Each structure stands twice: as structure tokens, then as C-alpha cells.
Amino acid sequence: NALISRVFVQPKGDLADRLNSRVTVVILAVSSALLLSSHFDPITCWTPAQFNAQWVNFVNQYCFVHGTYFVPLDRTKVSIQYYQWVPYVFALQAFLFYIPRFIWKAMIAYSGYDLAAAVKYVDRFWSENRDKDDKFKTRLAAFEGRPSVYIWDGIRLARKKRSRNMALFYTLSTVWQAVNAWIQFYILTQLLDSSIYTLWGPSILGDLLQGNDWQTTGHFPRIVHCDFNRTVLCVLTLNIYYEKLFIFLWFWLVFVAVVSTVNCFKWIYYLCNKTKAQKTIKNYLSTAPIKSTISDDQFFSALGEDGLFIMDQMALNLGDIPASYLTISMRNICQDFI
Amino acid sequence: NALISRVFVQPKGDLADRLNSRVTVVILAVSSALLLSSHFDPITCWTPAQFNAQWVNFVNQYCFVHGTYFVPLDRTKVSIQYYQWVPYVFALQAFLFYIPRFIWKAMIAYSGYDLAAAVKYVDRFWSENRDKDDKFKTRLAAFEGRPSVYIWDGIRLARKKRSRNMALFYTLSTVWQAVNAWIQFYILTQLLDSSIYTLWGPSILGDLLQGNDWQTTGHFPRIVHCDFNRTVLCVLTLNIYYEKLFIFLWFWLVFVAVVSTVNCFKWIYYLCNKTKAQKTIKNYLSTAPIKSTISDDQFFSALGEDGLFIMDQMALNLGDIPASYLTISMRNICQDFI
Amino acid sequence: NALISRVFVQPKGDLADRLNSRVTVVILAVSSALLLSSHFDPITCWTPAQFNAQWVNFVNQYCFVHGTYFVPLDRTKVSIQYYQWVPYVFALQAFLFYIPRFIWKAMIAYSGYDLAAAVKYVDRFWSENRDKDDKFKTRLAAFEGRPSVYIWDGIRLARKKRSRNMALFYTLSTVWQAVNAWIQFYILTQLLDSSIYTLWGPSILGDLLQGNDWQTTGHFPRIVHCDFNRTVLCVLTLNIYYEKLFIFLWFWLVFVAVVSTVNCFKWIYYLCNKTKAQKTIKNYLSTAPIKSTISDDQFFSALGEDGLFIMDQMALNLGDIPASYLTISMRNICQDFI
Amino acid sequence: NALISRVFVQPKGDLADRLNSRVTVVILAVSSALLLSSHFDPITCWTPAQFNAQWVNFVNQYCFVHGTYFVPLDRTKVSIQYYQWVPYVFALQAFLFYIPRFIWKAMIAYSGYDLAAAVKYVDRFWSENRDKDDKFKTRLAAFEGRPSVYIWDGIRLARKKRSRNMALFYTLSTVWQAVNAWIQFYILTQLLDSSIYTLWGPSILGDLLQGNDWQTTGHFPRIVHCDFNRTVLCVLTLNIYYEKLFIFLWFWLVFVAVVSTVNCFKWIYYLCNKTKAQKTIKNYLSTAPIKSTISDDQFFSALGEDGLFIMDQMALNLGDIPASYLTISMRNICQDFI
Amino acid sequence: NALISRVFVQPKGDLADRLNSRVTVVILAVSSALLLSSHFDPITCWTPAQFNAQWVNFVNQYCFVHGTYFVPLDRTKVSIQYYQWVPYVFALQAFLFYIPRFIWKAMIAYSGYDLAAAVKYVDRFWSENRDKDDKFKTRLAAFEGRPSVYIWDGIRLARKKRSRNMALFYTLSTVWQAVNAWIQFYILTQLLDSSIYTLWGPSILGDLLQGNDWQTTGHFPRIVHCDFNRTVLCVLTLNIYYEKLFIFLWFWLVFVAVVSTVNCFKWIYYLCNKTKAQKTIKNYLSTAPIKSTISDDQFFSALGEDGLFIMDQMALNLGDIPASYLTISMRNICQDFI
Amino acid sequence: NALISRVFVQPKGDLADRLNSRVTVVILAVSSALLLSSHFDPITCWTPAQFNAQWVNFVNQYCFVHGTYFVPLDRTKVSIQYYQWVPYVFALQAFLFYIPRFIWKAMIAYSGYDLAAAVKYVDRFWSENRDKDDKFKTRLAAFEGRPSVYIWDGIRLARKKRSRNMALFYTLSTVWQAVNAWIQFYILTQLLDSSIYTLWGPSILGDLLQGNDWQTTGHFPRIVHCDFNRTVLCVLTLNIYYEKLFIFLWFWLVFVAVVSTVNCFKWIYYLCNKTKAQKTIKNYLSTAPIKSTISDDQFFSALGEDGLFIMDQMALNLGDIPASYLTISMRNICQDFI
Known about the structure:
This is part of a larger assembly, with six copies of chain A.
Chain A lengths: L1 H6 L11 H17 L7 E4 L9 H10 L20 H26 L3 H14 L10 H21 L6 H24 L11 H8 L14 E4 L5 E5 L2 H35 L5 H6 L11 H8 L3 H11 L3 H13 L5
Antiparallel strand pairs in A: 1-3, 2-3
């Protein structure tokens, strides 16, 4: 519960359902650690001649490492062996699922504007004096003094260092996310042999919901024979788990794809439109009863390079009410800039 | 006790008996984790020829994975095999029971008004200065200053973002809840074979309360034979649990349905009536001895879009006394809005 | 989790992806501790004559310590023995990966200016009064009083003790880092025999993705024979792990090289250019609206010996916003020095 | 992790790489505790007649305690027995490595001036009011009042008790350190027999990097015979560790010697020169812009007996910046002494 | 680690290397608890007739409790039996080593002046206001007010109760310490038989460093025969420890003697001289620049009965600087006494 | 370590070496719990016919519960059986050793003056404001106000309730203590048979220090025969402990007697003399330089009934300095009483 906490609870990225990669890592790591641990008896074999308890402890290993085969109980083309495949390809899947978070962190470090620190700053500020009755009716000026100047200084200091298209870097991160999810699903498809039957939810379920476990479908057995060179049959207790999770995992994996690529398009149409991207800010700026000097045009031209993305991240992490105040205050203070 | 706490105690949704899904998840997960753990000897078989202690450790597995059959002790149509069925279909039931909470959270995030944060805010406010003697006779103005403005700013900021029918989203969540419960019950009905006898509380109990365990009812055995191809009988110690909980679980499961669909209708009649939906608010507004300027008509027209649902959620979570104050104060401050 | 915390979380060096050595140490130590612990049955052998359970517990050891051999199942040149090699050469790799951090710490102690203490000082200062509203509009003078004088006194006190080329010592540390990484990769290449086949990612993968496990590629077996002098075959359960991580580790190891040598060049071009090295400082000094007396020429001539490197370390560890203030203040106070 | 903490983390001696003795103690104690614990099967023997499981549990002990021998597989002069030697001589090495710290502590107690208390005092003082903004511009007078008078009173009180050559006692401690390291290395050289081959890194490695494990080099075997009086062979699983650490330890041990004797010379040239020993103090005294009354000659004649060594210890433990202040203040206050 | 802490860390007697008794207790208790615990197989015997696993579990006990004998492998005079001797005589040694601390505590309680309380009082006082800047320039008067009056009241109150020769009681305690150490060493000498060979470091080492383990020296065997009445040989795995610590312990034990008897003489010459006993006090009283009224003669005549010993204990426990202040203040206040 | 703490550390009775009963309870309880736990194999027997591993597990019990006998190896009068005796008579000894503390507590509760509460009160008072510099020069009046009035009110309130001879009750408790110790020693003497040899330190040691273990002294054997009715010998591994502690315990037990009866006489001579009982008080009252009005005669006549014993208890628990103040203050305030 400590490593899962290290990967899930302790780091704070509250992205829009992009904690699905962070939870997929946990799911696949749990699977890969619970499979090869052998439920601490994967396979047990029987040769009806004699058993000095030292034949069995060896022939088990032999039929495990050396491939087995299967025949319908009534031709040996079905040579089932995917035990050197799965319990490690799953860990590899977990690692390739975690990669894009590292890519995005490194990319934001290259962009030159530490976003996580700014989010945490506005967060502990909004949680520090949300309860001060005295500093609540001066709420606008309150947000004007302390944090707004900080965010603005960060903007000034980043604008001169490779930070005018941070949204471009982010949308590249998310398109990488989507392509990664599709590649993981495709690899899962060809996991068994890519020449013997390939698995996927609907077909295997529909077959399984007609009473076709293995005695009539052949594929996916649980009683397999292994030869011996100088035939012995045995029960393969592990297959009773694999399919009973492949049918699950497959479905779930598809879900991730469907929830990532869509999240890609929302983050590309944005980069294409640039006239409805400013809709949330233009909405926030219609709540202050001051309307003093600045028009939203010059405000955006002084802000619209990167400030839009940072304001979106603020509105996504902190909520909305503690973001409208921030943006209206940043409009108030943006006097001596443009 | 840590994961059950993660799922039950730590997140705070105090909905009206909709913690029944949150407790059903725990019940079914405990069942599915205690079954396949094998009470850490599911089945033990006996072939009265010889026992080198290496026949038994294998024939157990063989008769477990390969289906068995049963005959009344006096024809082989009863081929009992539901061990690849239950201990995983239960975990799947648990997951589909947990889904609707995720649906509702995502839906409220799409609606554009973080309700949980608002509830927690009014909660820690009402628990902060419930004990301040000085700020208790100024109770009305107290609720007027700090939290009422917050809730109202949230309303203003959400009204311009896809939030005018939050009650519609919520009633869709609850109708999904009801349909989900009925589907889980139906799946439980067809769990054994859907062609061999199907189970349900009253019949199996009435049969069990006449002395019809298996020696005369046939179905649900505990001493079954398994063949062997190149017959051996054995005791099936697991069946002594399954029915002894199916009779229970079934009943309990029905309960959930009966307590969810009714909770659906209460949350649909509401959406249909819109003249008794305002009854709690109209009742609260008959306790302040001020009756200053606003009539309940204009107050509702400025509020009745979403404010009704949020006030109901407040009255449901925080109690009632710390909600009448909130609503009377929100009426007091609603001067410069409509 | 305590020793990994001692090596990773507790000491605070936040260098630019030079925590890759600090994480490689953990990876290789985990590998070397999980291999020789024998997954607490590396090899199990079978001599089809008799087994009093005291032949096996000895012949295992004999075939383990004494080298085995392998033949394709259809000449004995393949004498596989790398069990006295790997699980200790990995620990040695971990130690040689950790060395450069020790080299750099000793080198900075010889240079005569404790950098870690200065970083921690500016850190706890910037985290002490980042929240003081009163001492935030006096931010420039705030950084002028307390920490700037400290950093400047350190500069004065080090300038007279073998500290004018601290950047030279650091770039020597990083070139040692790069050469070390390349040497570790090269040693990994020749790990098996350097006369029998040598391993490397692309070839072994491409062979493994055509169905060439060992039955047709010969090398990397899992069923090997061992002789006996006064032949017995056996299964080598350990090989099913080694390759399944060598293919991984190899790749990862290459990554380190590619991410270290590049980090070397960035830290050499710097030492060669000395006109774009001053780019970050010249950028920071274009944000204060004072422009009082000092030109960047004399400022650098009073600072450019070591101050550049220390300012870079500050900007790298603390972020950027709490570094522009530091450097602009150090320019403000640098009146009575040159 | 508690005893290692007692010996390493809890006592605070931060000497210049003389924590190498403190870490060598840990290394050798870990080795000596992990060897004789038998990796909780050092040796297992085989007599191909019969095995009632009570011959083996005894003949193991017999061939372990009674010496074995070895012959190249093709004369009995190689009688390998170093199991009564190593796992205890290592603990003895650890103890003799720890001795010099005890010698130095007792010697400083005999000198009559508790140095550790003075260091801890200036440390908690410099860490108490390093953050007081008010008591930072009065920094010189601050160090003048509280701690400087303490150090000076200690000097006065020790000068009349066998403390005028504390540096002599310290350099004797360090020359003992060096001689001890060389003696430990020499003992390690003659550890096997001093008549049979003696081990040392380069030769044994160069032989091991040509494929000369034992089948052709004879020495260092792993399959040895033991006789029996009223021959049985056996595998010696322990040798697969010994060399695989002797090659390591040897190297590391040499390192200590090379890093101690050099540290001796730096601490003897000092005692010989007495004109560059005062270089750090003469450097510190060129940073205060006061230059009031005292010349460095009379200051040293009032201080140069022991104060030099104590100032060096301060500069070594606390850093440098909190030592220049101390020494300049001690010069300021040294008015009414000489 | 709790009982060792109870005996070592928790009680605070910081005597001059008289913590050697306190650490010897721990050493010998660890030895006596690790020996008779049998390394949780002391002796294992072999009778080459038959082994039903119930002969061995009994003949072991028989040859253990009943004495064995030894013959050089080529007369039975060497009847080795010291297993009923050592692992309990060691615990007895530990107890007799701890006794003198109890003697000294009881003796100081009979003397009528609780010294430990006075030491702890001056300790927590000197550690309370060592950091008060305000109460540091008034240091002399500070020590004059609070603690000096306490120590003086204790002196007054003890002088009338059997306390004028507390130093005599203490030197009796230390001479008992020395005699006890010599008696423990002598008992260790005669531990084996006092008629068969007696052990002592130099001879047994010099013999062991010539290759004389037992095959040629006879004494100290590890393969011994035991008879049986109505001969069976066996390996004595315990002897491989005993000598390998006797050689150590012996040496260490001698050390204690050499460090205790010398500590006796320093504490007797004192009691004999009474003119250099006052040297530390006469030295302390040459550091105050007041020299007001009292000469050291009358001061001693008012103090020199017991105050000398208490001042020595203070200077030994608390250090020296917080003792010179105490004694100079006690001279200042000693006006209205003599 | 929790029950030993409950009996030793947590309750605070610091009587003059009457913590010897409190530590004897622990010693004897540890012995009685470590004996009958069988060092978790007390006796193991051998019948040289056959051993199906089910004869031994029963004949052990038979020869254990049924008495054995012993013959010198060369008449059966020595029928050794004290295993139903010791490991429970020791626990009974522990209980009878603890009784007198209960007797004394009940007796002080019957006397009508809670002494423990008064001691704890003066203790936390003297430890509360021992460090208040301000309330230290007013020390006499300080003790006059708060605690002295409390002790005096307790005296007043007890004098009218069966409390004029509390010293008589206490000396009865201590004479019971002494008689109890002598009875425990006597019972230990007759522990074996009272007709067969009785044990006591000097004789058994002197015999054991001449080489008379059992082969020539007969008594105290370790190899005993047991008959069988429808002879088998066996080793009695438990005797190797019993004597090896009886020789110890005996000695220690004598010590308690010698240290208790003497403590009885000191507490009887007191009750007989009543003119040197007042010596400590008359000594304390010669330290205040006031000598105002009261003579020690009338003071004692107003106090000497019970106050003497309570003052002694104070001086014994709290030390002496915080008792002279108490008694001089109680003399000061004793104006309006007699």
C-alpha cells in the first residue's frame, strides 16, 4: 500500500481523467506481480507409473519451461505456450503507460515555467485565507496583492525562455498519450501467438456464453499434454485465471483508448480554433461590476500566448470560483504591461 | 481494514441510503476474496485403490478444473460446474455496482459546479463557529457574510456553463442506479446454468425447510462423482458455503432493488412536479420574523434553476438547522440580482 | 524501503536528470539482491535411476558450481556458465554508478565553498517568508538584506581558496559521469563470455520475435546437461529471468548513456563559449524597473568567475522566480566591491 | 538498522574522510555477521553408498571442522582450511578499525578541553539565530557577545592544564590511524596460509579474467575431498562468496590506506611548518573593514598555541562562513589578554 | 536492545572509564545468553550401526551431559567437560562485575548527601540558561543565585551526618573495583580444570599461529569420543566458538584490570597528598578578575572536607567551563560561613 | 517487559532496600515461568528395543509423571522426584514475597492518612518551582504557603482517626517482612525431600569444587532410570539447570534475610528509644538563622506523635534538602496549634 501510494496519492496531478494512466499502471503492476508469484502451483503433471516425489518436482519444471501442446479429446498444431510472454510483457506495458507523465514533466521543465509550483502556491494561498472573515470582503484586492503578482512575474520570466507555445507541447504530450494507448491495445491483441487465434472481448465472450469452454472450442485449454525425450498429461491451473482476466482487461483497455483519443481531440480543436479557446476567460470577465479600463482584446494580446493554458490548468485543479478571482485580478493589475 | 476504509469511511457521500451501493461493493468483494482464497481445500476425492499422496494432489485438480456430475443415490444430466463462474462474476458485480458513483462524479464535473467542495465549505464553516457565543446572536448576518456569498458566486459562475438542469443529470444517475441494481439481480438469477434449475429465495428456502437438502431434491449436491479418461467420487466441501450465502445474498440483493427504484421515483416525481419541489424552501422561508422585501416568486425565478437541488443537498448532508439559515440568508442577500 | 529512501529521498541533489545515476543504483541493487536470493530453486536436475532425496540436494549443488553445457536436441562447445558472473558484477556496476556523486561532493569540498548549504539556506528563506504579506511588497529589499549578504560573503571567502574554476571541476565530474556510463554499458556487452555470442537489444529481440527461443537458436538455453566424474540433464529455471531482464536493462542502460553524454556537451560548450553562458543572467537583469548604476560588464567582472555557476545551481534547484530576485538583488548590493 | 545508526548517524564526528574508519567498521561487521550466519548450508558432502539422512547431517560437520584437501581433476599439498580463520578475524579487524576513535576521544579528554561540546555550542548558536533578521546586521557583535566569550573562557581554562600541543596529540592519533590501516591490509594479505598462495587484487583478477576459475589454477577450489578415518567428496558452496568479496574488499582496503596515510602527511607537514599553518586565519582576517588595533603577530602569540587547531576544527565542521565571523570576533575581543 | 538500554543508556554515571564495568556486564551477558541458547546443535554423534532418528536424539543428550574424552589420532587423561562450567559462570561474572556500582550507590546513600541529584540539578540549570543572552553577561551572579545556594545547603545539611570522608568511601569503592577485576581474571584463568592445561592469551595464540589447532597440541579438541555403558565418536561444534572468544575475552579482561588498578592509584595518591588535590580548585580560582576578600586557605578550611570531591565530580560530569563558574561563585558567597 | 514494569517501575515505593521484595518477586516469577515452559524437552528416555516414534512420545510422559530413581554406576533409595514440587512452589514463594506490600498499604489505609498522596504532592511541588528564580529567594515562605498547610491539615484530620501509632503499624509490617523472608528461606531448605539430603550453599559448593558432580556424590543426578509395569534409562536434561540456579538463588535468598532483619532492628530500636528518633529533626532545626519563638520541646509535643514518621518518609523519598525546608517551615507555622 506504500508503493501504490507513492505512485497514486502522493504526487498531485489532477488532470482530466488522465489519472487513468496512473491507475492503469497500478492495475497492470498488480497483475504482473500476482501472476508470476504463482498465487503464493501453476502446473501439475501426472505420469501413471510411479511417484517418488522427486519425479514430480522435476517433470513439473520440465513441462513448464519446455512448451506443451493440446489435442481435443476425441492434430497437435495447438502448441500453447504463453508463460514466458505474459507476466513480463504486462510489466513492460505498465512502464510504457507511465512514460508519458515523465515526458510531460520533462517537457514542462524544458519550457521554462514550473507549473506545479504555481498551482501549489495558488492552492495553499486559497486554502490559507479562505476562512479569514476580515480578508474576505477585500477578496478582489486580496487576490490582487499576493498571488497575482507571483503568477505575473512567472509569466514575465518565462516569456523570454522558449515559452510561447506551451499548449503545443501539452497537446503533443496528449497525442503521444493516445498513440501509446492504441499501441498497448494492439500489443495486447497479438499477445498469444499472432498466428494462432487472437483474442478480443466480443468473440471470446459470445463463445463463452454458449457453453464452449474448451471441450468444443479447442483454443484456451486447461488440460494439456507434454512430451518427454530421453507423453505425460497435466492440469494447467493457471489458465483458469488468464482468460478470466483477459476478457476483463481487454474491455478496460479499450475504455482507456476511447477516453484518451477523445481527450486528444478536445486538446487539438482548441489549438486550431483560438476564438473559442478564449471562451472561459471571456466568461469569467463578465462577473465583476467594475468594467474599468481594459478591453478583452488588449488583455488577451498581453496574455493570450501562455496565460490561457495556465488559467485553464488553474481552473481544472483548484476549481472554478478560486480561478475567476485570479483572472479578474490579473486583468485589474495588467495596467503597466501592454 | 484499510481498503474498506478507503472505499467507505474516507470519501464523504452521505446520500439517502445510496451508501447501499458503497456497502454492497464491500460485501461482494469480501465474498469474492474469501471464496477463491479457499478458506486459507475446496474438493477432496477418493479412489479406493492406492494413495501415494501424489495421486490425490493431482486428481483433486483434475476433478476441479474438469467438470463433475451428480446422480441421486439409488441420469447424469446434472453436470454441476459453477466454480469458474462465481468467484469472478462476484467481483464483476462489485465493479458494476461501484460504477454509478463514478458516473455521477464525472457528470457533476461536466455540469461545471463542484458540489462536494461547496458542501465541505459550508460544513467546516458551520462547525467552526457553531460554538462562538459572540457570533451566535448575529447568526443571520454571520451566515450572510462569509458562506452565502461563496455559494452565490458559485451559482453565478456555473449558470453560464451547462448548468441549468443539474437535477436532470442527477435523476439520470439515479435511474441508472436502479437499472443497474435490477440487472445485477437478474444476472444473479441466471448464475448457475439458466438451463438447469435457477435459484431464488422463497422456493429454495421452502424446500430447505422441509428436509430436502440434496438426498431427495437432487439439485445442489455435496457428494459428486468425476470420471477419468486415459469413476471416482468425492466430497465437495465448497457447496456447504455457496447456498448458505446465496439464500442470504439473494434476499439482500432484492432489498437494494426495492430501496433503489423507489428512490428513483422520488427523484422523478420531483422533476415532474416543480410545485411541491419548492415545498422545503417555502417552509424554511416561514421562520424568519423579518419578511422584508422579496416574495418567494422572484426569489425562485432568480434561484429555481439549480439552487433548489443544491439547497436539497445541503439539507441532506449538513442537517436542517444549518440549512434554513443558509437559505434565509441567501434570500436576504438576493437584492441586486434579479 | 528504508535504504532506498536513504539513497533517493533523503539526500537532496536535484540535478538535471542526474538522478538517473541515483535511480540506476537502486535498479541494479534490486536486481543483484533479487537474483542471488533465489526468489525466496535456481536449478533442478534429474538422473532417472533412483532418488533418496539426498542425491538431488547434492547433485543440484554440483551441477550449479561446476559448469554445465548444452547441445541442440538433434557439438558441446556451448558451455554456459554465467552464475558466478552476474549477481555480483551487477552490484559492482551499482557501486561504480554511485561513485561520481562522491567524486563531485569531495571536489566541491576541495573547491572551498559549500554549495549545498547555500542552496538550503536560500531555500528555507524563500519558503519562510513567501507567505508574509507584509514582507512581499518589500520583496527586493527583503532579498537584499538577509540572504544576498550571505551568498556574497561566501563568494568573498571562497575567492581566496582554490575557487575560480568551480565550473571546470563540475564539467570534469560530468565527463567522468559520461565515461563511466559508457564503460558500464561496454562491460554489460561482454558479460556472457566475450568469445561466445555477445548480447545486445536489437539482434536478440528480432530473433526472439520470430519464434527462436532456444530450440533453433542454440544460445541462451533453459534445459542443459551436466556431466559427472567419479551425463545428467536438468532444467535451469533461472535463465527464464536473466534474458527477460537483459533485454530490458540493456535498453535502459543505453538510455542513460544517451542522456549523460548529451548532458556532458551542454556542460562543455558552456565552458567554451563564455558569451552565451551569461545569457540567463543578462535575461534576469532585464526585469527590474530601476536600472540604477551598474552595467552588466562590471557586474560580471566582479561576479563572472564563480557566481555564474552558483546562480545556475540556484535557478536549477529553487526554480526561476526565486532566483531572478536573488540575482537582481546581488546586482543592487554590488556597489562597494569593484 | 539501529546498531548501524548507533555507530554511524548518531555520534557526530565529521572529520575529513575519517568517517572511512566508521564505515569500514560497518562493512566488516556486516561481512562477519553474514558469513558465519551461513546465509540463513556452507558445505554438502556425498558418499555414494547409502543415505539414511543421518549420515549426511554428521559427515557435513566432520568434513567442516576437520580440514579438507583438494586435487586437480587429472599432490594433496593443497589442504584448504580457512573457515576457522575468516569469519572471526574479520570481526577482529572491525574492532581494531574502531579503536583509533576511542584513542582520540580519550586523548582529547586527557588534554583538558572538551572540543565536541564547543563545536556543538557554536553549531546550535549559528543555527539558532541564523534566521533572526534583527540579529543579522549586528552579526559581528552578535558573535562577539555570546559564543566568543565561551570559546575564549575554554581556552583560558585549558591553557593551564596539559593543553599546549593538542595538535601533537591529534597528529599522533592520525599516524596511529595510518599504521593501523597498513597493519589491517597486511593481515588481510596473509589471511589464507602465508605459506600457500597469498591473495591480492591484480594477480587474482588477471588470472580470473582469462578463464582460470579453479580447473586450471588449482588454488581457490569449490569441489574438495575430505578423508574419513575409523575418501568422500563434497561441494563447498561457501567459496563462491569468499573470493567474490576478497577481490572487492582488498581493493577497498587499499583505498583506505591510500586515503589515510596522505591524510597523515597533511597533518604532519602542518606541525612542521607553522608558517603556512596560519594561512587560513590570516586569510579570514582580511575580510573585515575595520582593521582597528591588533596586528596578526600579537594575535597569534596570544592564540597560536591551541587556538589554531580549534579554529580549524570549527571551519571543518560548521563550514567556513560561520567560522570567519568567529575568528574575526575573537580578534576583536582579544584586547585585555596579551 | 531494551535491557541493554536499561543498563547502559538510561542511568547516567559518566565516571572516568568506569563505564567499563557497565559495558563488561553487557558483553558477558551477551556471551552467556548466546552460548546456552545453542545458536538458535552443540554436539552431534555418530554410531555406524543404525539410525532410527531416535538413537541420535538421545545419544546426543547422553554424551553431552555425561563427560566425554579425547585421544590424539595415532592416553585417555584428557576428559574434556566444561559445558556445565562456562555458560553459567559467565553470568555469575557479569553479576559480580555489576556489584560495585550497587556498593557505591548504597555507600553514597549512607554518607548522607545525594550526589546524583545535585549533578542533575546543576546540569539542567546549566542547560536551561546557557542560551539566554540576557542572563549571560550576568553569568557570575546567575550562578551565584540559584544553584550555588542549593549546593551549599546540601553541604551544610550533610556535614552533620557521617559525611566528612566521602572521598574515603569512594576510594574504598574503587579499590573494591580493582580487586574484583583481578578476581574475575583469576577465575577466568582456572576455568577449564586448574589441573589440565590453563589458558591465557600469549601461549595459546603463539601455539595457534604455528599451525597447532588440535591435531598436534592435543588440548582444546573438536572431535571427541564418548563411551557407552549398558565407544562412539562425535563432533563438538561448540568448541569452534569457545576458544575463538576466550582468546579475545581474556585480552579484553586484562585490559579492564590494567585500566582499573591504575584508576585506583590515582584515587589513592589523592587521598594521601591533600596538597595537590587542591590543584584544580586553586587553578579555577585564578580566572576571576575580582580577588575580593577570601584567601584560598580559609576557603578550603570551610570547604576542603567534602567540597573537593563534589567539585571534582561536577568537573568530571558537566565539563569544566560550567564548573569554574560554580566554584568561583561558591567562593564569592562563602562570606558568612567561616 | 510490561508486567515487570507494572510491578517494578510504575508504582513508586522507594523504601530503604525494601525494593528487594519487589525485585525478588520478579526473579522468582521469571524462574517459575522459564522452568515449566521447558525452555521453549525436559527428559528423554531410551529403551534399546525399537522406536516407532510413538513409544518415545509416551514413555517420556510416563517416566516424567511417575517418579524415577537413581543408582550409582557400580541401593534404589534415591527416588528423585521434585518436578511436581519446584516450578509451582516458586510461584507460591513469589506471591508470599509480594504479600507484605499489600499488608502495608492496607494498614496505612486503616490508619487514616494517605501517605503516598502526601509524598507525591510535596514531590510535584518541589519539582514544579525548583527552577523558578523568582520563587527561590522566598524559599522559606514558599514552602510555608502551599504544601506545609496541606501536610498540617492532613495531620489534623488524621489525629482524630486511629492515627497516633503509625510507626507501630509500620514496624509490625517490617517484622512481618523479616519473618516472611526467614520462612521463605526455610521452605527453600526443605524443598527436595526433607528426608533425603537437604541443600544449602556452602556444602554443595565445596563438594562441587572438588570434582564431585554426581558420579561419586550420588545425590543430584542427571542420568536416571525409570521402571515400567505392565527398566529403561534416560537423561534428565532439566537437572543441569536446577542446581546451577539453586546454588545461586540460595545465596541471594540469604542476602534478603540478612538485609531485612537488620532493617527490622533499625525500625525497632527507633520505637524503643524516642530520644534519638528526634535526632534528624533536631538536626534540621539547626540550619535556619531565625530562632524565633518555639522551642523543640513544644514543637515535638505538637508533632511527635505521627509527624516524626511522616518527616522520615519525606526525607527518605524526596531527598534531604527538600525536607529540611519542609520541617523548618512546619515549625514556623506551628504557632496557633499548641
